[PDB]
Amino acid sequence: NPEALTVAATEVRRIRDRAIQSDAQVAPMTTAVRPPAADLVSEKAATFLVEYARKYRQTIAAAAVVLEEFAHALTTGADKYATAE
Amino acid sequence: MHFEAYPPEVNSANIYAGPGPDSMLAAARAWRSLDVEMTAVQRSFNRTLLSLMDAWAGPVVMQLMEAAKPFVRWLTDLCVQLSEVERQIHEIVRAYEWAHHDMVPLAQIYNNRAERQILIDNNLLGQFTAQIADLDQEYDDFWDEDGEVMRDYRLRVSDALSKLTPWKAPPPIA
Amino acid sequence: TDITVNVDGFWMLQALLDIRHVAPELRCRPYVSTDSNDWLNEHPGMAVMREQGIVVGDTVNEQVAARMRVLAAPDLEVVALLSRGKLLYGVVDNEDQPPGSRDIPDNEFRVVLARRGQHWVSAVRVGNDITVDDVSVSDSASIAALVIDGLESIHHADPAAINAVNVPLEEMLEATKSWQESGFNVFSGGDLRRMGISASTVAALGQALSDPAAEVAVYARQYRDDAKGPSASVLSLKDGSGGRIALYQQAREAWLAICPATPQLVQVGVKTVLDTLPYGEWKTHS
Ligand SMILES: [Cl-]
Ligand SMILES: [Cl-]
Numbered sequence: 001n002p003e004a005l006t007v008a009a010t011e012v013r014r015i016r017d018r019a020i021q022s023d024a025q026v027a028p029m030t031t032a033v034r035p036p037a038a039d040l041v042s043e044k045a046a047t048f049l050v051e052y053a054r055k056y057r058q059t060i061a062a063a064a065v066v067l068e069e070f071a072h073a074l075t076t077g078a079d080k081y082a083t084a085e
Numbered sequence: 086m087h088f089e090a091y092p093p094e095v096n097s098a099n100i101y102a103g104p105g106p107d108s109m110l111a112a113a114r115a116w117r118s119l120d121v122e123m124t125a126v127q128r129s130f131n132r133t134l135l136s137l138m139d140a141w142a143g144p145v146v147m148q149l150m151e152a153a154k155p156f157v158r159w160l161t162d163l164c165v166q167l168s169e170v171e172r173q174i175h176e177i178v179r180a181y182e183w184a185h186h187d188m189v190p191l192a193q194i195y196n197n198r199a200e201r202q203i204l205i206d207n208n209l210l211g212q213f214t215a216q217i218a219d220l221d222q223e224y225d226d227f228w229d230e231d232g233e234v235m236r237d238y239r240l241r242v243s244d245a246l247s248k249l250t251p252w253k254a255p256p257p258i259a
Numbered sequence: 260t261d262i263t264v265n266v267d268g269f270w271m272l273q274a275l276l277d278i279r280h281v282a283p284e285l286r287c288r289p290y291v292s293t294d295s296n297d298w299l300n301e302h303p304g305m306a307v308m309r310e311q312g313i314v315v316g317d318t319v320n321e322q323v324a325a326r327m328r329v330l331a332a333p334d335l336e337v338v339a340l341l342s343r344g345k346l347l348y349g350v351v352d353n354e355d356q357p358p359g360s361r362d363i364p365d366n367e368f369r370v371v372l373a374r375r376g377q378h379w380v381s382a383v384r385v386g387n388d389i390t391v392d393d394v395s396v397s398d399s400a401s402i403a404a405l406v407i408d409g410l411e412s413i414h415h416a417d418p419a420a421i422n423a424v425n426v427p428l429e430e431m432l433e434a435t436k437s438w439q440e441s442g443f444n445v446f447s448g449g450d451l452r453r454m455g456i457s458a459s460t461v462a463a464l465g466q467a468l469s470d471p472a473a474e475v476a477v478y479a480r481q482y483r484d485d486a487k488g489p490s491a492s493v494l495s496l497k498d499g500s501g502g503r504i505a506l507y508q509q510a511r512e513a514w515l516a517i518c519p520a521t522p523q524l525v526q527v528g529v530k531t532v533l534d535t536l537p538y539g540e541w542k543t544h545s
Binding site for chain 2: 494
């Protein structure tokens with residue numbers, strides 16, 4: 001059955017779009033953390049959280065690529081059986 | 086970070102200045118929505134794979150799940166980490182609020198110094214010398230108290246951050 | 260038998276031995292217990308103290324550590340602040356002095372005599388160096404002799420030629436403040452004379468207060484359970500053109516004694532400081 005592979009490819013790309021959209025929606029807040037005070041502890045906390053947000057965005061961009069390569073494989077594998085007639 | 090080496094004017098002024106924890110609280114609400122959204126992503130992904138396994142249930146698909154497993158477990162691990170971020174940001178905000186509260190107010194420090202100079206300005210006959218030394222001990226007490234408050238603040242913040250483990254790269258599927 | 264460390268080194272010994280504060284007059288950095296004292300091993304002063312044997316590995320020489328424990332929790336503290344010139348009571352007047360500076364004025368020498376049980380220890384700070392050692396202290400006279408010896412080591416002076424007198428303290432401070440405000444004008448000594456102070460005493464006093472060559476302030480502190488208290492009276496010695504004068508309150512609103520700094524009256528003044536301590540007999544107390 002090739003039509004199921006096409007359906008999965010469509011849902012994977014939808015899921016990818018959600019991951020990408022939620023990351024982008026909240027990035028202005030997660031990367032805008034400021035130290036609540038001028039001491040070094042407050043700075044170490046805010047700096048950690050900004051970098052932690054930034055590395056999360058990279059991790060998600062990488063996950064978006066894994067999902068798109070998965071949808072592509074699903075579509076390519078579906079066109080291997082729908083024309084194999 | 087050995088803040089006990091800095092005088093109370095420094096530690097007290099540093100914690101009282103700044104914009105407060107609002108930007109931290111806004112980020113906790115944001116991280117918390119990511120947790121909600123990515124739990125939905127994880128649930129939809131598992132469901133997508135199970136529907137495909139149901140609509141064909143053959144060797145071709147059973148091998149796609151095997152090549153997908155590493156990503157699926159990665160996605161589970163990501164959900165656990167996401168749920169921790171908001172919790173630890175609020176632990177940090179509380180640490181800051183307790184540091185702010187327990188730190189000696191600058192006014193007390195200024196008043197100590199001001200009272201000391203009034204005794205100096207009237208110590209020609211030396212009969213306030215001992216009370217001057219008492220005021221020096223109180224200032225050292227302020228120094229010690231601020232050092233203790235920053236110690237505990239650093240340790241609470243250090244513990245909260247230690248629980249935010251590094252994001253790992255997602256494995257490939259195809 | 261004695262040792263000398265800079266202010267940094269004295270603070271490390273406090274850390275190695277978990278001593279929070281010593282006498283404030285030594286003006287050392289307070290030590291605050293944390294999760295680690297290993298960052299102390301990075302200070303250069305640590306290896307310097309390892310060479311003198313003060314610290315063997317990570318353990319402080321036990322004779323020295325015994326002396327630090329007296330300073331750390333004494334039953335009795337006797338303090339003497341000595342100056343060449345006017346005594347500034349710790350004030351270094353440079354507006355580039357950082358907050359909480361541990362410096363002391365270059366003209367100031369600070370002597371703390373601590374007792375625990377019968378163990379008498381000496382802590383003396385000059386510049387940025389502190390010297391710790393045992394000290395033989397028996398009666399008021401031994402303390403008086405130690406102060407005088409420290410004072411003469413700065414500037415020699417003979418007892419001023421004045422007539423001893425007791426004056427009301429609050430009236431005296433008010434009249435002394437006005438006299439200072441007038442510049443110590445020879446015509447403004449009126450209300451000091453009207454208090455019964457001799458024309459000779461007024462002249463020597465004005466010289467000692469106006470342009471001293473050396474001063475000493477001596478006072479004491481006693482400790483019970485966790486409460487503390489200073490001597491109600493302070494002994495001030497001052498060296499003016501007209502000789503060395505001694506000022507102190509007598510056991511008691513209060514009365515200030517104005518005396519020539521005779522070895523006997525300096526002994527009387529030290530005793531009067533110790534007998535105004537709040538918790539009674541100073542030679543024996545815990
Ligand atoms: Cl909170
Ligand atoms: Cl991860």
